[PDB]
């Protein structure tokens, strides 16, 4: 989903920014003179195919001219696959690394300051609102991939990772894949969307028979994700539970958890604006709503969720920008 | 698991404190003049048996005298099963209600101040240590089905500052449906035997090395179940126990940090003298605070609310 941006092409270098995660490898590049930023994603585990795509991009978008190509790598793979990369691209101007947290922040900051129609709020009440993007700072980034990293940015170039969590997209995809046997992330999202978590979850209402306003929770609030199930090829003979219900429950469970940790991190760091990055939302309305509600709920309106059109490309984008 | 205590039998009343939670129904009482505190737990699912037990207790330890029995009920069951309670005890001295967070805190604070050998620390390196102002402020992480978190800054100054739906229920639920484990006990056996890297993506899997710039070694868990969408039940168990326990750990740390708290007491039905769990929770606290915060555990971790209700009669 290309972006129009006036790039500086003064050094006549074709910059291939790659971000090789645990699961997803992202590429950001701009054919010289195009004023277009282009983005692809392929699985990390298809490492061969990832390299074919890289050669293919040089072939088609830079006239097969290796000598003018600079590879800039970020994410774990910048170390882990560096040798393989150096070996597979003998003729390039060079392959260099850019630090992962710097990349994320550099990419996000760029989108926040330079790309119209990139940053948006979303809940079910309000719909989608595009932001017309130094009341920027400080801001939080919650980067949801397989796992979750949380970074603060106090000002341009001043950032740090303040924490993270092992309960991310990878937990969601993994649990629901094994349990319900969904084959796509899309399919589990559709299953979630039409499901009912109250079949598998304990609500406050189940415990109290009513609201619990003294602690600020309604009957419908979730007390225990999957709380009803102990209290009741393999799992198919295990299952007495609706797959869509399971998918809903676990999507709420993980999102709400991310929401809470984001909130707590924002709290500590006196941040109002929370940006969600990574591969997790994917413009999925329910997901964005759950995240926005969690932030709103915990902050009582005082803090705000934000999403990004190019949410999965923060790292690769930052890497790209470093090669200036 | 009786505590011996010098109670005030000033009212001459048999005070029967109950805390009916979502899964667990708890009871604390003292036979008059015994100076004994007694504790039983029955599943909420078996509410009828819990009711039968309350009758039993009155018959056995208060001499069949309903007239001098005062029930103090807390937990959501005090609301949801009010009708059953009144139906069971129309003729007792009173059925009082005590608010649940106040009961938790009153229970905890009494155990911290008054009962020797109740509060301990535990990890794999140092073993169990019994602890014998410097008390406040403190945190309570109450884990049953879900999680409540409370801050207590002075004797009668506390609040629930947040909570989590990812509790023991999430663990028992996923592990029971995925693996087939019968009991919380047999999850810990499976987990004891387990290697989580089978299903968890580690830092070392992503970087081929440490990421010490962010303070994470190659063996740190980047994504629980992160290998699963590209399986040994022991591995699953250990993965999810880490997943849930570390999360609770992190959230406890963050809440403690927001509130400038050093000491974090765990209550509920989750630790239950399970060494691994207690180690996991301690380590998370340790890790996130670089050793400057501390997990504490309680011999009667499950009875905080009943205990606080019991004390409200006093
Ligand atoms: C892909 C990449 C970047 C390697 C990665 C790694 C891990 C995760 C998510 N997992 C995670 N993140 C954490 N985790 N676990 C902890 O256990 C503690 C923690 C903070 N801790 C650091 C040391 C000082 C004390 C505070 N941050 C996401 C992405
Ligand atoms: C049994 C009993 C006591 C009924 C119970 C209920 C819920 C849970 C766990 N679930 C949970 N706890 C939360 N949750 N979710 C939230 O979503 C938000 C939240 C705090 N929020 C409320 C409004 C002001 C800002 C802070 N506390 C455990 C035990």
UniProtKB/Swiss-Prot annotation, chain A:
GO terms for biological process: coenzyme A biosynthetic process; ergosterol metabolic process. SUPFAM superfamilies: Actin-like ATPase domain. The keyword Ligase does not apply. Its EC number is 2.7.1.33. Gene3D superfamilies: 3.30.420.40, 3.30.420.510. GO terms for cellular component: cytoplasm; cytosol; nucleus. Keywords: ATP-binding, Coenzyme A biosynthesis, Cytoplasm, Kinase, Nucleotide-binding, Nucleus, Transferase. It catalyses: (R)-pantothenate + ATP = (R)-4'-phosphopantothenate + ADP + H(+). The keyword Cytoplasm applies. Signal peptide: none annotated. Regulated by feedback inhibition by malonyl-CoA. It comes from the Eukaryota. One of its GO terms (molecular function) is pantothenate kinase activity. Pathway: Cofactor biosynthesis; coenzyme A biosynthesis; CoA from (R)-pantothenate: step 1/5. It is found in: Cytoplasm; Nucleus. It holds the Pfam family Fumble. Changing residue 318 to S: Leads to thermo-sensitivity. Plays a role in the physiological regulation of the intracellular CoA concentration. Belongs to the type II pantothenate kinase family. Present with 6190 molecules/cell in log phase SD medium. This is Pantothenate kinase CAB1. The gene is CAB1.
């Amino acid at each position: 989903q290309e972006i129009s941006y006036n790039c500086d092409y003064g050094d006549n270098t074709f910059n291939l920014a790659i971000d090789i995660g645990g699961t997803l490898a992202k590429v950001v590049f701009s054919p010289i003179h195009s004023n277009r930023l282009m983005f692809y994603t392929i699985e990390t585990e298809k490492i061969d195919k990832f390299m074919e795509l890289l050669h293919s991009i040089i072939k088609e978008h830079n006239n097969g001219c290796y000598r003018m190509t600079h590879i800039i790598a970020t994410g774990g793979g910048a170390f882990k696959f560096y040798d393989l990369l150096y070996e597979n691209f003998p003729q390039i101007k060079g392959i260099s690394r850019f630090e992962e947290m710097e990349g994320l922040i550099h990419g996000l900051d760029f989108f926040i300051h330079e790309i119209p129609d990139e940053v948006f709020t979303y809940n079910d009440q309000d719909g989608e609102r595009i932001i017309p993007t130094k009341a920027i700072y400080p801001y939080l980034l919650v980067n949801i991939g397989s796992g979750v990293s949380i970074l603060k940015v106090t000002e341009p170039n001043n950032f740090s990772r303040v924490g993270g969590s092992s309960l991310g997209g990878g937990t969601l995809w993994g649990l629901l894949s094994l349990i319900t046997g969904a084959q796509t992330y899309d399919q589990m999202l559709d299953w979630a969307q039409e499901g009912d978590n109250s079949s598998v979850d304990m609500l406050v209402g189940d415990i109290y028979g009513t609201d619990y306003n003294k602690i600020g929770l309604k009957s419908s609030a979730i007390a225990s994700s999957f709380g009803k199930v102990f209290q009741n090829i393999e799992k198919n003979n295990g299952q007495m539970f609706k797959n869509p219900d399971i998918c809903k429950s676990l999507l709420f469970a993980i999102s709400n958890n991310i929401g809470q940790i984001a909130y707590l991190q924002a709290k500590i760091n006196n941040i109002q604006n929370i940006y969600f990055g990574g591969s997790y939302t994917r413009g999925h309305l329910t997901t964005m709503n759950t995240l926005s509600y969690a932030i709103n709920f915990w902050s009582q309106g005082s803090k705000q969720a934000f999403f990004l059109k190019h949410e999965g490309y923060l790292g690769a984008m930052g890497a790209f920008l470093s090669a200036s």
